[model samples]
Target: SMSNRLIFDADWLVPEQVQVAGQAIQYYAARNIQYVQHPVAAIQVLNVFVPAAYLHGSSVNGYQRATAPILMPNTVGGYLPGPADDPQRVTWPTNAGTIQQALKRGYVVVAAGIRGRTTVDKSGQRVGQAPAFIVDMKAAIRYVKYNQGRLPGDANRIITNGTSAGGATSALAGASGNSAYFEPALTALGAAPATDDIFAVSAYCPIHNLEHADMAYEWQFNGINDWHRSGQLTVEEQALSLALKAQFSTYLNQLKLTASDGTHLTLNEAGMGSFRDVVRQLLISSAQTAFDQGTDIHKYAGFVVTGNQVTDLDLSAYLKSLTRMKAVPAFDQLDLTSPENNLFGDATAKAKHFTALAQTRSTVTAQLADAELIQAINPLSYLTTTSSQVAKHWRIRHGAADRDTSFAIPIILAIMLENHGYGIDFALPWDIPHSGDYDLGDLFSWIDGLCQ
Candidate 1:
């Protein structure tokens, strides 16, 4: 049932040599890592790059591309290949600016990729996840330690920086602290385990959880049309889960089908009715449909995914259209130029000031929940300065115009980091959309401060 194919590739361009008093001292080649599928899985390839870096004397440049592929064992991997976004894979070398910026400041940039697609594991299965991902990183660090003679970096001062999902994973790896289990995924094929923490992490508009966010919630909830709900409640259910598998489960009994029956496979009356029921639920439950009918309360109101739900929502297409639709430019086009833009409807805005009876009730309602559960998960409650021995610093650069991911994540991260007693630098530029070099220099500056 596990179905995914991953591709990985890496390229590096290290300066030919450093001019010392009397001789030309060569640096290691630039080590680059690229992965297919999600950045999380790509992170597992840190193992392959470690020994490769050491052999090339990568540490001479004071940097190593630490990506190692971490694949799950005993997993059957299938081939579900897709095309790369562009006509050519060359674009001033991906992440070129970030690398150049670091190099200019005497920092070596290690381009990296995870395991499955980019590197061949002449050793095991191709499936992967976070456990393998974090381990790959850990192993890469250890490789640097053992091969210090051949490597060039100050083993103690390596750092990780990634955009969007990559950044999100790096931050989590750092925040999550040390883990032996996660590190072993990279070493299952004869590589030794790594046991060090990530030095520092820098990320851009990262998405940790989609269900909890407003835009994702609305798209999955509001995309249902009324016609589907009115004549056939069956069709409504389909819109709710967005998965054929889940839809089948919700209406199994009503359709007179049990898990043992072969009805789920056939297009008979039971199967037909089961499929339609899902669509019906979506239309009835969606706020967009309710709004058209003049409902008093709109569930997605005052959120980023506001306006004509049909025109704005498309998560499936968004994931598919990667290279053609870059994140930075796409998110910058949003019209969130003022406080007024933050309010959903004029009436909803007006209601906030009156502090209607519901505010009091909601406050009491919020207070009644499990305090310990809430505190443990609250980002603000944990001060890295106190509870955490490892220091944490983050910089989030977002395209103020990006409609995709939006600027919401950076703002949320900022508030969380601040409340947790950590200093974070946040920049939401008016010019860029979902990406670009908005303020990476500032992040490098932070890294420099830490390095010394």
Candidate 2:
């Protein structure tokens, strides 16, 4: 039975003494979370656990090859900074009960210790590490595969899953498609060479796109409106680099955000000193286009839309909506929905400023497209760390009520994979929130009949 466990305490062993409940079931009932809180100078440790019951697939030739995989578990979890010498090494307020469900279906579980944490600290040298946490994952795969008499692991059928930041990292691990992301461990494997191919990945409330996502959250939640009022650089920074001064002037002209109203936002270049001027010009260009079009933006300056068929119709409604802001003038005397005041029927803005702004925003937004980011962090960038044969499968299921991240993350990922010539299962149940009320019966049936 001791042989059935894959536990080690090499230089990689990590200690995570985060708070958790006494039992996995109790922890699940209370929703206990795991963490290795970091000091200002160090990285956090991740308490990881990998079990041996991951091989439930059918077998033939006296169990030499796994087959009849109908009952096999398609699930596996990788933890960062797992316990040393102990097979199940995570510590939390309670046990991780739900995770056991995967085991019943033959799922293998994996956990890891992040680089630059745990043992690295005791060594006292400033250990440098990046997002390449996947390398430790390779060590995990080898541990399970080579220890067959001790543990039955399907190294080729590994899938990554996690929550919050972990969720985001898992996506990057699989999608980045870069084998070097796991550089350190593969080097330890003695092969000094191996492939880092992840079969599938799932994320929950993940921070998929940092930039635009930050923008959307700021506008929707933060009081700031103008992309570049004066102090804060906003999403507009991504839209235009040239002709920005003119663009911003026009945009502000339409909004008329007086410093008195305290409703303006600008990007501060201090954080990006080198790219400061470049961001300024690009944003200004975007704003100018929005302003020149006199699209609904003009209404913000207190301009009432009087035209029936022009962009004014949209501008009027747009302006009226601005009234929702505490600083907005009542304008109660004006009929906001009137045909002459609404933007219901207009040909979109034609002003070159507006045109340019629209074009620039699109171009900038496109910069965050999945493929480009993935390519920048994918296996293709790590030629020596991967094998020629590539296998990929992506499945995404999101709850409707989830708000830790945008629904767009998975939705967009599915679309991008299709465009990239991959088929991934994309399921969206609108009623789900960030984490609550999962319908187990439906989910189990779906997974039961599912195929890789």
Candidate 3:
């Protein structure tokens, strides 16, 4: 009965025990099951872990979760190719990775291996590009849903989680569910026809919003001009940063996004002041929580806190503390050398620009048009246009110290989703870096509450 195209082998589900969040948990693991019939052989495999309680004729944590919520956590970083996880050999720092944590919590975990930006086809063509990773993710979801009766978890409760670029893809998968934007890509790969919609999304420091990232970056770190990647800026760099920052307001105005309270989230010509209030409030709230928990806030001297309320803040000082991580025109670099540049590349071209500025500055012939590629990879584009149901629940985290992308990136995303009447648990972890699964306990707790 398990001989169906996408159904996993029952014998492959080996009994294993792992230490997760300091508890020894027993589970069943199915590893390296191919999800697609692609030519780039090994990049489409996925692994599933079901708690042993489901198979041992017993219940775990007061529940017989034969229909447990499935966790689809992709292990992707910097948009580079990585293989499927080995459930039996699963390991993470402090034993806090999502896969192990989910297994320990009596939830099924499905870790998928998706093609990244750098993945190439057999004829030496760049096969994995902008929408490739996201398409692969959706295909994996379809695979799970296709084998729903054969798989061990509830197909309707699949939650996607990832870090950085993976986080971006997770958000895209969550937002672009069942949208026709990816139909061509999915159809080309023979992806299962099952719906790709997910129940929820948990993104950690998602480095996305490519078309507008450069402008957003300049908006955040404009005053402190010392680029982290490069020492000092050249004349061209300064001009580009200023020009991009100037264009940000137009983009913000076009979005027409607003906060839950009907406050317009737009930027001025200098790309500052208008949206500064929201970020300030978020920072103050984070600091207030830390202070109430007896955590020291002495390091943040620029804030004026009165009775657990941040009455005033020196916004410039706060931004200077984080500094800048990228150069002017960060994402769509003029030279087409950024990771995002490689992400939007095609089979024939190794890299291409996704923004007009980059395209104008680029000396090489662009293989693809700017707007289409940008819209294809951006979650906001789908969320804005789709009348179809998007993921109802969302958890977005951007570390305070993560300068990999601008804080505005995730903030804008949160605002858009919230404006559309979606439930979002958005936060800026006080001192966290550009990482994921750093707060597995809290993440799992949120998941439990939602699944219930």
Please give, for residues 145-202, the per-residue lDDT of candidate 2 as tens digits: 3433333334555565544434544555566443443454345333213344555555
Report the C-alpha lDDT of model 3 over 1-452, residue by residue, as the tens digit: 12336655556788888776567888898887778665364678888888898776676654465568888888777887645665454443112255676777878888787888878777667777767788889989999888787778788889998888889988988888897878887777777769999999999998888888998888777767787746777788888888887887788778888766787877777666657778888877777767788877656556777876667777778777767778877888777787888887777677888777878877667754457667877888777743455888899999876889888889999988887778789999876778888888898888888877
Superposed by TM-score, candidate 2 places the C-alpha of residue 244 at a distance from the truth, in angstroms, of: 14
Count of residue pairs whose backbone atoms collide, per candidate: 64, 51, 0
- Cα distance off (Å), candidate 3, residue 334: 0.7
Whole-model lDDT, candidate 1? 0.35
lDDT of 1 by residue, 262-368 (tens): 34312232223432333222222343444456653222222223554432323323312211221101111122221111111121121111112112323222211
Which candidate ranks first by lDDT, i.e. highest? 3
In candidate 2, what residue range of length 10 has the lowest lDDT sum?
326-335
Q: For model 3, what is the error of residue 175's alpha carbon versus the real structure, in angstroms, after optimal superposition?
A: 0.4
TM-score of 3: 0.93
TM-score between candidate 2 and the true structure:
0.45
